[PDB]
C-alpha cells in the first residue's frame, strides 16, 4: 500500500511545518513580552 503510506507521510510533514511556524510565532510573542520590560 505504497500510496497510503505516502499520503500519511505528507500529512506528517504538514503537521511539522505548522508546528515550526507556531514555534516562530510563539517566540515573537515572547520577545514582545520580553520587551515592555525593560
Amino acid at each position: 500500500q505504497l500510496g497510503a503510506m505516502q499520503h500519511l507521510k505528507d500529512q506528517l510533514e504538514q503537521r511539522t511545518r505548522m508546528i515550526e511556524a507556531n514555534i516562530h510565532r510563539q517566540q515573537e510573542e515572547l520577545r514582545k513580552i520580553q520587551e515592555q520590560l525593560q
Partner: protein
C-alpha cells in the same frame, strides 16, 4: 499497523502528536503570561491585586 510500525511512521505520528500537545500547552501559558503583562505595565501608568 504492522507496516506503520516497520516504516516507522508510527513513532513519528506519536512523537508529532505529543509535540503538538506540548506546543499547545506552551501557547496557553504564553497567552496567560501575555494577559498578565499588558496589565502589569498598565498598572504602572496611574484589579491587579484582585487578580
Amino acid at each position: 499497523l504492522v507496516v506503520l510500525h516497520k516504516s516507522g511512521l508510527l513513532e513519528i505520528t506519536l512523537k508529532t502528536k505529543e509535540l503538538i500537545r506540548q506546543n499547545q500547552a506552551t501557547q496557553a501559558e504564553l497567552d496567560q503570561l501575555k494577559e498578565q503583562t499588558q496589565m502589569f505595565i498598565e498598572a504602572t501608568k496611574s484589579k491587579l491585586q484582585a487578580s
